[PDB]
Design a protein around this ligand. Structure first.
Ligand SMILES: CO[C@H]1O[C@H](CO)[C@@H](O)[C@H](O)[C@@H]1O
Ligand SMILES: CO[C@H]1O[C@H](CO)[C@@H](O)[C@H](O)[C@@H]1O
Ligand SMILES: CO[C@H]1O[C@H](CO)[C@@H](O)[C@H](O)[C@@H]1O
Lengths: 107, 107
């Protein structure tokens, strides 16, 4: 745990920065907030708690930024289906075949 | 120009699938909607228009999912600054030093 992020480096969930003397810790938490702690007492934060923040990156173009991960907005909900292939057939039916057979079709 | 998305594959902004007979087109659009067309007639949609959907992936586990891209929620706003580094100091101040001095801090 060092005290510097160079252009290209990023803090991820859990990952943090420690000051030289080891008094101050800037830590990107899993709650989505980048907090600064002075001996177990939060003194500043980004105020992004309750958000899906995955990385806090010092970019090349020259700005520190916190990004949300890619959020799922629509899914067929067929987790764990083996060897899946989506096919658009000539019968105007979009189907999602699996190892056992059709897992999802709009029909 | 194809009719199949095997495990791992995805549709990317603007990309599309085409049925064997060439009557039907599934296309992830720029506006965000995954829509199936019957030559100018939208027969089926995900209703994800308006959202920042970047890919529509047939995942390895089995689940076909649409994802909205990573969105910045907090930033320092110093784009255009050259050679930047974030530093948590012993005086407690967190500073983003640029090639021409401190670009952002707490003071
Ligand atoms: C909760 O787990 C399921 O949903 C997420 C996102 O919706 C997928 O990434 C994952 O593979 C599963 O299908
Ligand atoms: C409201 O319209 C939106 O959705 C339809 C599909 O229903 C598309 O044809 C159209 O380009 C837009 O994305
Ligand atoms: C007031 O001085 C402090 O704050 C400035 C921000 O302008 C830092 O650059 C500097 O190193 C000190 O920590």
């Amino acid at each position: 745990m060092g005290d510097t992020l160079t252009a290209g480096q990023k803090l991820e969930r859990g990952g943090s920065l420690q000051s030289g003397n080891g008094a101050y810790t800037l830590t990107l938490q899993d709650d989505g907030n980048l907090v600064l702690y002075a001996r177990d007492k939060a003194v500043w934060s980004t105020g992004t708690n309750g958000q899906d923040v995955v990385r806090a990156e010092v970019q090349t173009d020259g700005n520190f930024v916190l990004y949300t991960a890619e959020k799922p907005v629509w899914h067929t909900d067929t987790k764990g289906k083996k060897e899946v292939k989506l096919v658009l057939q000539d019968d105007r039916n979009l189907v999602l075949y699996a190892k056992d057979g059709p897992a999802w079709s709009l029909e």
